[PDB]
Design an enzyme around this catalytic site. Structure first.
Site, PDB file in Angstrom:
ATOM      1  N   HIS A 123       0.799  -1.211   0.000  1.00 24.40           N
ATOM      2  CA  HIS A 123       0.000   0.000   0.000  1.00 24.40           C
ATOM      3  C   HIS A 123       0.827   1.253   0.000  1.00 24.40           C
ATOM      4  O   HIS A 123       2.050   1.201   0.096  1.00 24.40           O
ATOM      5  CB  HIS A 123      -1.008  -0.014   1.153  1.00 24.40           C
ATOM      6  CG  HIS A 123      -0.401   0.018   2.516  1.00 24.40           C
ATOM      7  ND1 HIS A 123       0.051   1.176   3.108  1.00 24.40           N
ATOM      8  CD2 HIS A 123      -0.240  -0.959   3.440  1.00 24.40           C
ATOM      9  CE1 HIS A 123       0.489   0.906   4.325  1.00 24.40           C
ATOM     10  NE2 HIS A 123       0.330  -0.383   4.547  1.00 24.40           N
ATOM     11  N   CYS A 139       3.069  -4.826   6.544  1.00 22.51           N
ATOM     12  CA  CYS A 139       2.851  -4.482   5.139  1.00 22.51           C
ATOM     13  C   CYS A 139       4.101  -3.816   4.514  1.00 22.51           C
ATOM     14  O   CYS A 139       4.950  -3.272   5.197  1.00 22.51           O
ATOM     15  CB  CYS A 139       1.644  -3.555   4.969  1.00 22.51           C
ATOM     16  SG  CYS A 139       0.018  -4.347   5.082  1.00 22.51           S
TER      17      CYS A 139
END
Lengths: 164, 164
Positions: A123, A139
């Site tokens: 992301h 992440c």
């Protein structure tokens, strides 16, 4: 057409979470013999193309903090990334791009791309100074400009290989 | 037709040893651009087809000690295998069947099938008790009847994916 080797200590539910689909809809549905979990056998994951037909391949290096996009075994672009903290590391191994969503906002920035590990994705970010560092909950983070670019290009099913 | 992304630290000899080819021929002869090898580029490996043109796919689970053979992503055959000991493990990742030799004999039994890592292969055995165990120097061993059958079906160039 995507086939997944069920690994040891996979349950049916952890597989459905990883691949962002239901345990029934095809999981049992796509795979009829799912009548008892079977480590080492192979099942199909309904929504996704065979990833060997996608000539893109993403390679992450946690140590170098890079994400590299290749096309037919030639690197095309390399981007800097944030990765997980030492106590909340980005996991290594073989994953796939499952999903995306444009402009999630907040700390997820311009785009979310789900990886085939439950709760993990690639992301963007609203903390751009964090890129290049081991700072995340796990992440991979990118500058917004780069995740937009990566999402524009790679289809769901694209292989993502993460190494130390 | 089989392509390969040059990794950081690959040399002509290291690549040649993994793919059981010579350095000049086939290797320089196929990529003429090899007056200098560069990490991230694509080279072709001579003597082998594009693995995507082969509709078979072998998937190996180290933990479960199974080797599955699939055709157009349906499982055709499942075999028990021996794998590497914990200090001499069978490596994970994507390999290919490079070449083969019928009835090598000795510890290799009825067939040797080279994989695309130097010194690694799938082979038979004169120690049938070893099958189903973590006992090898790193190769995948099979019962003689099974490696004969496997070899009779899959061509050189077939993808072999090895997972933990």
């Amino acid at each position: 057409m995507l086939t997944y080797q069920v690994k040891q200590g996979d349950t049916l539910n952890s597989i459905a979470a990883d691949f962002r689909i239901s345990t029934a809809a095809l999981l049992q549905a796509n795979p009829s013999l799912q009548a008892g979990l079977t480590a080492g056998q192979s099942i199909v994951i309904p929504g996704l193309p065979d990833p060997y037909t996608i000539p893109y391949h993403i390679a992450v290096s946690i140590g170098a903090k890079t994400l590299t996009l290749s096309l037919n075994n030639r690197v095309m672009k390399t981007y800097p990334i944030a990765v997980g903290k030492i106590l909340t590391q980005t996991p290594t191994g073989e994953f796939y791009i499952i999903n995306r969503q444009r402009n999630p906002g907040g700390p997820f920035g311009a785009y979310w791309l789900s990886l085939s590990a439950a709760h993990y994705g690639i992301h963007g970010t609203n903390n751009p100074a964090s890129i290049g560092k081991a700072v995340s909950k796990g992440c991979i983070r990118m500058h917004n400009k780069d995740v937009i670019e990566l999402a524009s290009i790679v289809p769901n099913g694209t292989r993502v290989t993460i190494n130390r």
